[PDB]
Tab-separated table of all heavy atoms in Angstrom:
chain	number	residue	atom	x	y	z
E	1	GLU	N	0.844	-1.237	-0.015
E	1	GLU	CA	-0.024	0.058	-0.025
E	1	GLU	C	0.782	1.217	0.050
E	1	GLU	O	0.235	2.398	-0.072
E	1	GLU	CB	-0.925	0.135	1.130
E	1	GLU	CG	-2.123	-1.094	1.192
E	1	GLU	CD	-2.944	-0.911	-0.009
E	1	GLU	OE1	-3.450	0.426	-0.163
E	1	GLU	OE2	-3.293	-1.799	-0.729
E	2	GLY	N	2.130	1.141	0.110
E	2	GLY	CA	3.063	2.280	0.153
E	2	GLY	C	2.872	3.103	1.420
E	2	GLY	O	3.026	4.378	1.232
E	3	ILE	N	2.721	2.457	2.512
E	3	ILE	CA	2.535	3.231	3.659
E	3	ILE	C	3.841	3.768	4.291
E	3	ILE	O	4.951	3.069	4.185
E	3	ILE	CB	1.960	2.325	4.834
E	3	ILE	CG1	0.629	1.736	4.210
E	3	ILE	CG2	1.679	3.042	6.084
E	3	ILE	CD1	-0.152	0.756	5.249
E	4	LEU	N	3.851	4.934	4.855
E	4	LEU	CA	5.085	5.564	5.184
E	4	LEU	C	5.304	5.755	6.693
E	4	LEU	O	6.346	6.136	7.135
E	4	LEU	CB	5.173	6.994	4.582
E	4	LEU	CG	5.102	7.092	3.087
E	4	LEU	CD1	5.110	8.598	2.617
E	4	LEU	CD2	6.269	6.349	2.429
E	5	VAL	N	4.179	5.299	7.439
E	5	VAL	CA	4.233	5.401	8.856
E	5	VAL	C	4.685	3.995	9.579
E	5	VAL	O	4.802	3.098	8.778
E	5	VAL	CB	2.904	5.882	9.492
E	5	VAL	CG1	2.558	7.255	8.859
E	5	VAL	CG2	1.810	4.864	9.232
E	6	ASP	N	4.834	4.036	10.815
E	6	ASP	CA	5.086	2.778	11.642
E	6	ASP	C	3.885	2.081	11.888
E	6	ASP	O	2.716	2.503	11.670
E	6	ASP	CB	5.926	3.019	12.774
E	6	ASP	CG	5.401	4.070	13.743
E	6	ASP	OD1	4.116	4.283	13.869
E	6	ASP	OD2	6.051	4.792	14.538
E	7	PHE	N	3.980	1.031	12.651
E	7	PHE	CA	2.872	0.145	13.068
E	7	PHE	C	2.008	0.916	14.084
E	7	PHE	O	0.658	0.720	14.078
E	7	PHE	CB	3.321	-1.238	13.654
E	7	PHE	CG	2.264	-1.974	14.051
E	7	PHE	CD1	1.575	-2.770	13.081
E	7	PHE	CD2	1.863	-2.210	15.409
E	7	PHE	CE1	0.539	-3.614	13.429
E	7	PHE	CE2	0.858	-3.010	15.689
E	7	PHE	CZ	0.210	-3.878	14.774
E	8	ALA	N	2.654	1.721	15.000
E	8	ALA	CA	1.967	2.465	16.088
E	8	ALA	C	1.112	3.563	15.446
E	8	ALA	O	-0.030	3.865	16.009
E	8	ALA	CB	2.838	2.934	17.024
E	9	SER	N	1.489	4.254	14.423
E	9	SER	CA	0.940	5.409	13.768
E	9	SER	C	-0.197	4.896	12.755
E	9	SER	O	-1.017	5.782	12.343
E	9	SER	CB	1.890	6.344	13.056
E	9	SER	OG	2.741	6.760	14.012
E	10	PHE	N	-0.104	3.582	12.535
E	10	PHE	CA	-1.013	3.113	11.513
E	10	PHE	C	-2.571	3.138	11.828
E	10	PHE	O	-3.382	3.426	10.944
E	10	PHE	CB	-0.670	1.616	11.181
E	10	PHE	CG	-1.578	0.951	10.148
E	10	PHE	CD1	-1.745	1.557	8.909
E	10	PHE	CD2	-2.114	-0.224	10.360
E	10	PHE	CE1	-2.492	0.998	7.909
E	10	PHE	CE2	-2.964	-0.892	9.384
E	10	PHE	CZ	-3.068	-0.286	8.116
E	11	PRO	N	-2.977	2.756	13.156
E	11	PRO	CA	-4.409	2.924	13.399
E	11	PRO	C	-4.875	4.421	13.327
E	11	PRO	O	-5.983	4.554	12.911
E	11	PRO	CB	-4.428	2.325	14.908
E	11	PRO	CG	-3.369	1.458	14.960
E	11	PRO	CD	-2.214	2.158	14.217
E	12	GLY	N	-4.209	5.276	13.765
E	12	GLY	CA	-4.446	6.747	13.779
E	12	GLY	C	-4.769	7.312	12.374
E	12	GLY	O	-5.632	8.110	12.320
E	13	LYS	N	-4.110	6.782	11.426
E	13	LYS	CA	-4.301	7.321	10.002
E	13	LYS	C	-5.609	6.747	9.448
E	13	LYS	O	-6.154	7.364	8.679
E	13	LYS	CB	-3.104	6.976	9.227
E	13	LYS	CG	-1.780	7.612	9.618
E	13	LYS	CD	-1.781	9.060	9.750
E	13	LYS	CE	-0.547	9.527	10.289
E	13	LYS	NZ	-0.589	11.110	10.444
E	14	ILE	N	-5.860	5.511	9.834
E	14	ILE	CA	-7.170	4.905	9.319
E	14	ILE	C	-8.383	5.600	9.815
E	14	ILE	O	-9.327	5.924	9.059
E	14	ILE	CB	-7.242	3.483	9.849
E	14	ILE	CG1	-6.077	2.592	9.262
E	14	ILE	CG2	-8.550	2.775	9.281
E	14	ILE	CD1	-6.033	1.195	9.608
E	15	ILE	N	-8.302	6.090	11.084
E	15	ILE	CA	-9.449	6.759	11.768
E	15	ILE	C	-9.687	8.123	11.033
E	15	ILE	O	-10.811	8.629	10.849
E	15	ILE	CB	-9.184	7.003	13.189
E	15	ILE	CG1	-8.986	5.738	13.976
E	15	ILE	CG2	-10.231	7.832	13.833
E	15	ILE	CD1	-8.683	5.746	15.481
E	16	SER	N	-8.544	8.779	10.594
E	16	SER	CA	-8.671	10.019	9.960
E	16	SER	C	-9.375	9.880	8.543
E	16	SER	O	-10.176	10.654	8.133
E	16	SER	CB	-7.236	10.762	9.739
E	16	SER	OG	-6.652	11.065	10.890
E	17	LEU	N	-9.011	8.740	7.879
E	17	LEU	CA	-9.611	8.585	6.664
E	17	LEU	C	-11.102	8.141	6.762
E	17	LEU	O	-11.981	8.455	6.042
E	17	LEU	CB	-8.908	7.254	5.933
E	17	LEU	CG	-7.450	7.582	5.185
E	17	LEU	CD1	-6.956	6.467	4.665
E	17	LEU	CD2	-7.653	8.780	4.237
E	18	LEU	N	-11.443	7.476	7.924
E	18	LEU	CA	-12.707	7.068	8.208
E	18	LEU	C	-13.575	8.198	8.542
E	18	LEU	O	-14.789	8.348	8.263
E	18	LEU	CB	-12.766	6.081	9.499
E	18	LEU	CG	-12.475	4.642	9.177
E	18	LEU	CD1	-12.434	3.820	10.392
E	18	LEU	CD2	-13.408	4.027	8.211
E	19	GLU	N	-12.945	9.215	9.264
E	19	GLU	CA	-13.603	10.463	9.674
E	19	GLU	C	-13.968	11.242	8.479
E	19	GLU	O	-14.940	11.928	8.376
E	19	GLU	CB	-12.748	11.251	10.593
E	19	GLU	CG	-13.448	12.474	11.159
E	19	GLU	CD	-12.484	13.340	12.022
E	19	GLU	OE1	-11.318	13.153	11.958
E	19	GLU	OE2	-13.022	14.168	12.628
E	20	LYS	N	-13.074	11.117	7.457
E	20	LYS	CA	-13.445	12.013	6.134
E	20	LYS	C	-14.682	11.436	5.434
E	20	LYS	O	-15.402	12.150	4.867
E	20	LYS	CB	-12.296	11.838	5.172
E	20	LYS	CG	-10.928	12.550	5.689
E	20	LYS	CD	-9.827	12.543	4.675
E	20	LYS	CE	-8.693	13.356	5.097
E	20	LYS	NZ	-7.657	13.286	4.090
E	21	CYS	N	-14.875	10.089	5.697
E	21	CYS	CA	-16.042	9.505	5.080
E	21	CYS	C	-17.227	9.897	5.900
E	21	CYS	O	-18.359	10.040	5.197
E	21	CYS	CB	-15.929	7.957	4.991
E	21	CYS	SG	-14.458	7.369	4.124
E	22	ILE	N	-17.106	10.156	7.229
E	22	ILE	CA	-18.100	10.528	8.175
E	22	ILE	C	-18.659	12.002	7.816
E	22	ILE	O	-19.785	12.351	7.858
E	22	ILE	CB	-17.669	10.447	9.590
E	22	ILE	CG1	-17.409	9.056	9.906
E	22	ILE	CG2	-18.764	10.998	10.548
E	22	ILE	CD1	-16.898	8.783	11.208
E	23	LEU	N	-17.674	12.911	7.627
E	23	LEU	CA	-17.913	14.286	7.314
E	23	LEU	C	-18.064	14.613	5.835
E	23	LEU	O	-18.018	15.724	5.284
E	23	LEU	CB	-16.775	15.111	7.865
E	23	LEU	CG	-16.531	15.112	9.381
E	23	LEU	CD1	-15.298	15.895	9.776
E	23	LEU	CD2	-17.725	15.509	10.196
E	24	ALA	N	-18.224	13.496	4.918
E	24	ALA	CA	-18.270	13.686	3.597
E	24	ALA	C	-19.663	14.265	3.222
E	24	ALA	O	-20.778	13.910	3.732
E	24	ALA	CB	-18.350	12.388	2.837
E	25	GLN	N	-19.587	15.284	2.278
E	25	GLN	CA	-20.837	16.100	1.817
E	25	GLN	C	-20.881	15.997	0.318
E	25	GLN	O	-19.842	16.043	-0.365
E	25	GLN	CB	-20.652	17.524	2.317
E	25	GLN	CG	-20.870	17.617	3.898
E	25	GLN	CD	-20.769	19.014	4.258
E	25	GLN	OE1	-20.807	19.966	3.634
E	25	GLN	NE2	-20.646	19.251	5.730
E	26	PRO	N	-22.123	16.067	-0.207
E	26	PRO	CA	-22.324	16.023	-1.683
E	26	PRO	C	-21.634	17.114	-2.453
E	26	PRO	O	-21.286	16.931	-3.600
E	26	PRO	CB	-23.874	16.198	-1.767
E	26	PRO	CG	-24.349	15.622	-0.526
E	26	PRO	CD	-23.414	16.044	0.622
E	27	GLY	N	-21.415	18.260	-1.727
E	27	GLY	CA	-20.678	19.398	-2.424
E	27	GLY	C	-19.167	19.401	-2.371
E	27	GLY	O	-18.478	20.267	-2.851
E	28	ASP	N	-18.646	18.435	-1.687
E	28	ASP	CA	-17.221	18.286	-1.446
E	28	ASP	C	-16.471	17.750	-2.822
E	28	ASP	O	-16.980	17.002	-3.511
E	28	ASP	CB	-16.860	17.281	-0.338
E	28	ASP	CG	-17.454	17.773	0.951
E	28	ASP	OD1	-17.740	18.943	1.033
E	28	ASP	OD2	-17.579	16.979	1.993
E	29	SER	N	-15.286	18.279	-2.919
E	29	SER	CA	-14.460	17.906	-3.988
E	29	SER	C	-12.791	18.150	-3.440
E	29	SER	O	-12.599	19.316	-3.424
E	29	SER	CB	-14.816	18.723	-5.272
E	29	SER	OG	-13.932	18.201	-6.410
E	30	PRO	N	-12.139	17.102	-3.333
E	30	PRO	CA	-12.525	15.665	-3.514
E	30	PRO	C	-13.565	15.206	-2.358
E	30	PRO	O	-13.472	15.755	-1.184
E	30	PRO	CB	-11.192	14.905	-3.407
E	30	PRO	CG	-10.161	15.950	-3.441
E	30	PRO	CD	-10.729	17.162	-2.949
E	31	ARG	N	-14.318	14.106	-2.827
E	31	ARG	CA	-15.122	13.541	-1.775
E	31	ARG	C	-14.784	12.067	-1.330
E	31	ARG	O	-14.516	11.324	-2.226
E	31	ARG	CB	-16.578	13.537	-2.296
E	31	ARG	CG	-17.687	13.173	-1.292
E	31	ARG	CD	-19.121	13.166	-1.932
E	31	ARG	NE	-20.095	12.866	-1.041
E	31	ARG	CZ	-21.395	12.734	-1.350
E	31	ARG	NH1	-21.797	12.838	-2.500
E	31	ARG	NH2	-22.338	12.377	-0.333
E	32	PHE	N	-14.797	11.821	-0.036
E	32	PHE	CA	-14.249	10.466	0.346
E	32	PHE	C	-15.444	9.605	0.780
E	32	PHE	O	-16.534	10.058	1.274
E	32	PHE	CB	-13.369	10.722	1.647
E	32	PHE	CG	-12.104	11.277	1.388
E	32	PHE	CD1	-11.797	12.704	1.223
E	32	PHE	CD2	-10.990	10.463	1.119
E	32	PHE	CE1	-10.634	13.078	0.976
E	32	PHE	CE2	-9.829	11.001	0.942
E	32	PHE	CZ	-9.485	12.201	0.767
E	33	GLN	N	-15.348	8.349	0.334
E	33	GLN	CA	-16.360	7.430	0.418
E	33	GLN	C	-15.716	6.010	1.087
E	33	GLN	O	-14.670	5.648	0.712
E	33	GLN	CB	-17.007	7.177	-0.771
E	33	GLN	CG	-18.273	6.197	-0.734
E	33	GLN	CD	-19.534	6.953	-0.334
E	33	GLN	OE1	-19.493	8.026	0.153
E	33	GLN	NE2	-20.773	6.371	-0.571
E	34	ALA	N	-16.508	5.292	1.868
E	34	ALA	CA	-16.130	3.979	2.365
E	34	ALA	C	-16.913	2.917	1.609
E	34	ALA	O	-18.192	3.012	1.518
E	34	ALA	CB	-16.471	3.968	3.835
E	35	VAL	N	-16.243	2.038	1.115
E	35	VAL	CA	-16.817	0.828	0.287
E	35	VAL	C	-16.545	-0.543	0.755
E	35	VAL	O	-15.391	-0.783	1.084
E	35	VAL	CB	-16.457	1.043	-1.173
E	35	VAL	CG1	-17.119	-0.076	-1.923
E	35	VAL	CG2	-16.716	2.361	-1.736
E	36	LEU	N	-17.601	-1.293	1.030
E	36	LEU	CA	-17.405	-2.806	1.336
E	36	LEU	C	-17.930	-3.694	0.308
E	36	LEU	O	-19.156	-3.706	0.156
E	36	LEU	CB	-18.196	-2.901	2.718
E	36	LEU	CG	-18.002	-4.309	3.354
E	36	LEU	CD1	-16.465	-4.492	3.739
E	36	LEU	CD2	-18.857	-4.528	4.501
E	37	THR	N	-17.044	-4.371	-0.202
E	37	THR	CA	-17.320	-5.304	-1.284
E	37	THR	C	-17.302	-6.796	-0.970
E	37	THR	O	-16.111	-7.187	-0.461
E	37	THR	CB	-16.459	-5.051	-2.582
E	37	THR	OG1	-16.591	-3.733	-3.026
E	37	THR	CG2	-16.872	-6.009	-3.706
E	38	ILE	N	-18.321	-7.546	-1.027
E	38	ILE	CA	-18.398	-8.921	-0.607
E	38	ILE	C	-18.293	-9.739	-1.696
E	38	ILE	O	-18.947	-9.654	-2.776
E	38	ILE	CB	-19.697	-9.202	0.168
E	38	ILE	CG1	-19.885	-8.219	1.344
E	38	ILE	CG2	-19.447	-10.629	0.765
E	38	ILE	CD1	-21.125	-8.539	2.181
E	39	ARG	N	-17.317	-10.889	-1.776
E	39	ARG	CA	-17.126	-11.670	-2.877
E	39	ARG	C	-17.093	-13.167	-2.505
E	39	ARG	O	-16.022	-13.773	-2.538
E	39	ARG	CB	-15.839	-11.300	-3.519
E	39	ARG	CG	-15.839	-9.960	-4.376
E	39	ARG	CD	-14.582	-9.770	-5.062
E	39	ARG	NE	-14.587	-8.497	-5.808
E	39	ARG	CZ	-14.128	-7.392	-5.271
E	39	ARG	NH1	-13.637	-7.385	-4.011
E	39	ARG	NH2	-14.133	-6.200	-5.933
E	40	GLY	N	-18.243	-13.716	-2.130
E	40	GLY	CA	-18.395	-15.048	-1.743
E	40	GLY	C	-17.323	-15.603	-0.797
E	40	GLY	O	-16.478	-16.254	-1.071
E	41	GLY	N	-17.544	-15.153	0.599
E	41	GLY	CA	-16.747	-15.689	1.613
E	41	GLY	C	-15.525	-14.839	1.697
E	41	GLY	O	-14.648	-14.973	2.571
E	42	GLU	N	-15.511	-13.770	0.810
E	42	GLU	CA	-14.320	-12.756	0.737
E	42	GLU	C	-14.801	-11.332	0.819
E	42	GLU	O	-15.677	-10.988	-0.086
E	42	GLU	CB	-13.488	-13.055	-0.374
E	42	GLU	CG	-12.202	-12.156	-0.475
E	42	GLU	CD	-11.188	-12.458	0.621
E	42	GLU	OE1	-10.485	-13.513	0.397
E	42	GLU	OE2	-11.113	-11.635	1.507
E	43	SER	N	-14.298	-10.594	1.738
E	43	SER	CA	-14.819	-9.122	1.795
E	43	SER	C	-13.635	-8.196	1.776
E	43	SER	O	-12.605	-8.294	2.464
E	43	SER	CB	-15.533	-8.966	3.181
E	43	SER	OG	-16.054	-7.651	3.185
């Protein structure tokens, strides 16, 4: 994934990305979205 942080800083960066999906608005550009794709026992 080309991650530049350590293992300890890893959860904190995910939360920021998740928060961007939470505060996402139709008028935003760029707009962040969370997607969950299920593929037969694989998600």
